[PDB]
Amino acid sequence: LPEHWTDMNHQLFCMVQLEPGQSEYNTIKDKFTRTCSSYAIEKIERIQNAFLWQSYQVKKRQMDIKNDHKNNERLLFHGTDADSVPYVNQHGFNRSCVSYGKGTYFAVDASYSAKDTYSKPDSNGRKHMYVVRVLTGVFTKGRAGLVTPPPKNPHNPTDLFDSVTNNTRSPKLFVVFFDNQAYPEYLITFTA
Amino acid sequence: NLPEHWTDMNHQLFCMVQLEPGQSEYNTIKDKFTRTCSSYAIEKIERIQNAFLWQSYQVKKRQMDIKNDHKNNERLLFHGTDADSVPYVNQHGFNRSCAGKNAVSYGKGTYFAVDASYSAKDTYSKPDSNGRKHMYVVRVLTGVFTKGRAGLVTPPPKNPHNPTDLFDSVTNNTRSPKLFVVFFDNQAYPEYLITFTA
Ligand SMILES: O=c1[nH]c2sccc2c2cc(O)ccc12
């Protein structure tokens, strides 16, 4: 369980509200305000989910071996409705719950995830967006109807890309197709 | 730390090992199969050694063993497959997104049978162009389960007022389970592949 996490009194899940103006809060706030400076942050919470973290770190170690080094991780955004926040905190992102495939979608820019279509305002005008560690690894352009990423070579049809995107040269979204390829690290509660 | 009975894979992450009749390992699987599939004949039984699937499954098992109260969370179950799906399952395991709709649906997930006879149906273990049928023997994390329902995309909550605290799997009948449905990756490890014929 990582350093920057705070003690959980032998619990396996907790949401920890960050202290405004300390380094961790400022770092996450800056990633958001890069594209969402007109939105007001009410709070940022650190998601401390020991089981999801363990499963994600195992997939990371595997992808690091498979891809032979490489930076396989990106920090991306995911807007969700308030009704899905308890499920995601506890269980992460579930493809079963889609222009570039039937997976979970993550945005490069908070502004994309800040659309009311993704971060639906609740009865109080509050919107919710995760900052997500995503194992994007080696990626290719996606297409409608994919249930997994395409093969890297159709001569070896089981050796797959790790994720797909809208644009390989200048990506703005990534889609992953497997559980435990995405770890929800922070939850931003904000208003337009 | 892979199991010590596995063949040395000499840095490789994946291997199928052909078992020898007369070995306890072959005989236990043959017996489990023939209990309900005495009319079919086994061509061969291969042990599936998939390091990454094993690691991810064992992490999930350790988590369910912690979460549940001294429960036997693991059952050894059957899964019939078409020949076209065998390479993908061997490497990547069981993907709910690829699953057929079952004739009796208890949810949208991967189905595992208690009896080899269920999986031996041509609808599940489709005979290939050479008349070979394929069935996996699978370690499945059934955990704490309840009767499923066709609408499910995740197992249902144990308690309607705590929607995120889920059953581990669902079944057709809690009193006499004959099938189990799982809704998450790395909840099922394909351990053996039985190749068999009429
Ligand atoms: O942030 C997103 N949340 C959601 S919820 C379901 C779809 C999406 C989505 C799709 C994208 O292409 C890019 C971002 C997001």
UniProtKB/Swiss-Prot annotation, chain A:
Effect of H78Y: Abolishes catalytic activity
UniProt subcellular location: Nucleus
Residue span(s) of domain PARP catalytic: 1-192
Family: Belongs to the ARTD/PARP family.
Function per UniProt: Mono-ADP-ribosyltransferase that mediates mono-ADP-ribosylation of target proteins. Acts as a negative regulator of transcription.
Descriptive protein name: Protein mono-ADP-ribosyltransferase PARP15
Organism: Homo sapiens (Human)
Parent-protein start and end of this portion: 482 to 678 of 678
